[PDB]
Ligand binder design. Structure first.
Ligand code: DYU
Ligand code: DYU
Lengths: 465, 468
């Protein structure tokens, strides 16, 4: 009896600009926010778990708690509907095809149980289906066309009001005394992860951290060092929904006017994100080659041993290996570093499928969703949307090689003259550095000049086809 | 003639035994001895005695025997030197401070008697002193720096040749027909133990068992069940020396190669061993809080009754009690189960000193040496190395049906999975049909976890504010 509401957290792990949760509370006697735990690496799971602990803490401020439940949503929700006597369920819209299919299945389960479902857009700046409509029923496959469509859209509506005590009103959350025992956020070890020797996260999760960084980021806006994680970086918080894209949009617009009509390059980060979400939303095989209508079909090498050396940073190229080590250790690498390793794996040196690189980035990268990961890997491998040197790229960006020394400590003894090509160092240099190439650090896995010359010919064959 | 003794302590094996190999060279006679030197529980003693009978049986294949002697080494060895007219003594090096002090005293006594002492490294992958020298004179206290040091060392030389007929050559072992009466391996009852109702060992000791399980482990390598002892587990055989760390290292590399550059993660089990041995070797108070230069001073509770409930698996938390029951009964628990009970006792629930948990583990755990035990307990209690699990939720997450609980806490077998991890929440009618009244046939929880852990988190946060 009564109006009992559940808001389902997946993305949008925040209380600000949360229109679905705002609407779910309206007219509700009770409210319960739930997160349901279904390649994913340990840095992704730690960021998520920290996101849920920050949500729980913020909900405690409102005399509520987060409910964490393990299971598959299709089995879990029929039980919750009855146990809690639910009449309304709310979600932030998910544009990605697998999320679409999951949410369509839950909507059917909810309707059959008599539960009304509130769906609101708030993970993207725009209604992706409306952009596709203005473009004639197909997503744009060029960024400039996307810019044209966006510039004709209506102005962005204001972000939804933050969930506070005034919004909650008389709505309450029923809680047992053993809430943590049944619904608490688990630790990594409670999920069976090996955390031995794990250091403190370079990217701590949560809306609180995201809003702290947003304020520091904007105050700052008002190279070798670029390779390292910035304390005001926002990319993972946008992927998990800790930071609203619309709030970030409006704060940037507000800053720009304080210091007219801003160029759309002002929103370059947000717009590239929307582009890939829009391209992917109606393409269930967007993350594949075969069966993907927009993906060029290319005969990639099948080489699991070469793939493993790339994935684990054992290529013998310190520039490539340091990037993949920072990626694995911390979960974020510079955009141009993503270019560098993606080129090395696919069209550049190894000629391995972009699907394999995408799968590694899905496990390790914090800030790249399914759509953005698939679209970027297709783009950089010349597979859709119409060769870096693994020595010179790093040497030009960081001549002293401090980046290599930070993430490949075994190379720390090498001078800047050989830090990016240690195989060229004389034996005496290697001995004083206590690192014999081919013993303490591997030899380069390919001759870059020979491999790149071959692959360049292969793709020219593809594109003359 | 040249009469030699090889002193077994660790390294209870004939393969990759450089000290024994060097001792045999140029010797006319050889005698292998183990000295039973007066907390160690019955499962540790049984594993040891099975290692010694495997050693004795493998020495019989070479027309030799193991000589087992009860006494203190500083008293026994002056007698043996004269009785057997010994001029050669060999040992595998012991990095741990108490073993270091003992061996220095025996080396002095041997020199006084005119006996040369042969010492060879073979219990650890590396020369721990060479690691510390490379680091500038102090051990690394982060595992990342230790990995950096290890990746700069020379490649490991191959393990020593197995003691065979060929290696023994002309050397021989004088034997009497009364050998078992004088020097035999004793039984547990013969050491005064109560073995009534003891079931057959889940972890049988010895080099033969170790090498069998190594072969199966390599083949297999080529969840709720994780909690149970694996038939291919190697951890206790590495602690006792039935299996060489260096042999394991080389079989792992060979399996990997059949790339030439495996990540260090491949050898993860071995390097964490080496890390704690290195940290402990020059620290004679490594197992203490006061007077230990690397350990944060924390005002732990003194509560012997709560410690006893934890040690004996009477906490009232079935996940905790099942783990401690498996540990007592078999001598091995999963690594994550060790985290669970360590957090419950120290930083999590009871606020009892990590020194007390280490002493219980020292008595019951088969696979954790002094250095690894002390280092792990300091680590998990946030007391060193620059460092809260739910006692209901963790088990429920790991084994939802509760089969682990039903296996080790049979009084709870009747409870459904819904309450098997928190049986105090079960309605009385469930408790009645399960024939286990909570507070009568199985104790109530000894603490309110939510209240205890919240207060102890605040205690620890104050500790690190004082430090900062
Ligand atoms: C309370 C307690 C006592 C002992 C052991 N324990 N027992 C054995 C070993 C270890 N420790 C570890 O592996 C280890 C590795 C990394 C880190 C960061 C820690 C904290 C422990 C390796 S050999 C057999 C454990 C796991 C917990
Ligand atoms: C291999 C790889 C995977 C993923 C990402 N990656 N990660 C994140 C984002 C993106 N892609 C882009 O920005 C982007 C924009 C324009 C073009 C033409 C391309 C090719 C990528 C935006 S949000 C966080 C990148 C940079 C490379």
């Amino acid at each position: 009896m009564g109006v009992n509401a559940v808001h389902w957290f997946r993305k949008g792990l925040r209380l600000h600009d949360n229109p679905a949760l705002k609407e779910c509370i309206q007219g509700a006697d009770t409210i319960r926010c739930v997160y349901i735990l279904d390649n994913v690496g340990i840095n992704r799971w730690r960021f998520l778990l920290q996101c849920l602990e920050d949500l729980d803490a913020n909900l405690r401020k409102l005399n509520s708690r987060l409910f964490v439940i393990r299971g598959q949503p299709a089995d879990v929700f029929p039980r919750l509907f009855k146990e809690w006597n639910i009449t309304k369920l709310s979600i932030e819209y998910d544009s990605e095809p697998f999320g679409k299919e999951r949410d369509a299945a839950i909507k059917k389960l909810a309707t059959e149980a008599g539960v009304e479902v509130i769906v609101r857009i708030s993970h993207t700046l725009y209604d992706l289906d409306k952009i596709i409509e203005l473009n004639g029923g197909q997503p744009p496959l060029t960024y400039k066309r996307f810019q044209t469509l966006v510039s004709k859209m209506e102005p962005l509506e204001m972000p939804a009001d933050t969930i506070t005590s005034d919004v909650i009103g008389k709505c309450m959350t029923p809680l047992s005394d053993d809430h943590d025992e049944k619904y608490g956020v688990p630790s990594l070890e409670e999920l069976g992860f090996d955390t031995d020797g794990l250091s403190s996260a370079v990217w701590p999760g949560g809306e609180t951290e995201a809003l702290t960084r947003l304020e520091r980021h904007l105050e700052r806006k008002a190279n070798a060092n670029s390779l390292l994680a910035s304390p005001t970086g926002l990319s993972p918080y946008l992927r998990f929904g800790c930071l609203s894209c619309r709030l970030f949009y409006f704060k940037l617009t507000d800053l720009y006017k304080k210091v007219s009509s801003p160029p759309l390059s002002l929103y370059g980060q947000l717009l590239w994100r929307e582009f890939f979400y829009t391209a992917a939303t109606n393409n269930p095989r967007f993350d594949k080659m075969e069966g993907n209508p927009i993906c060029v079909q290319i005969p990639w090498d099948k080489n699991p041993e070469a793939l493993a050396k790339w994935a684990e940073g054992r290529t013998g190229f310190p520039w490539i290996d340091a990037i993949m080590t920072q990626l694995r250790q911390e979960g974020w690498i510079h955009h141009l570093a993503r270019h560098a390793v993606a080129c090395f794996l696919t069209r550049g040196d190894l000629w391995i499928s972009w699907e394999e690189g995408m799968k590694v980035f899905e496990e390790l990268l914090l800030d790249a969703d399914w759509s953005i990961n698939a679209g970027s890997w297709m783009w950089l491998s010349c597979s859709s949307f119409f060769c870096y040197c693994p020595v010179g790229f790093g040497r030009r960006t960081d001549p002293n090689g401090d980046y290599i020394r930070r993430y490949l400590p075994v190379l720390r003894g090498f001078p800047a003259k050989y830090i990016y090509d240690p195989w060229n160092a004389p034996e005496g240099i290697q001995k004083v550095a206590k690192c014999l190439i081919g013993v303490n650090y591997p030899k380069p896995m390919v001759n870059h000049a020979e491999a790149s010359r071959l692959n360049i010919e292969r793709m020219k064959q593809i594109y003359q086809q």
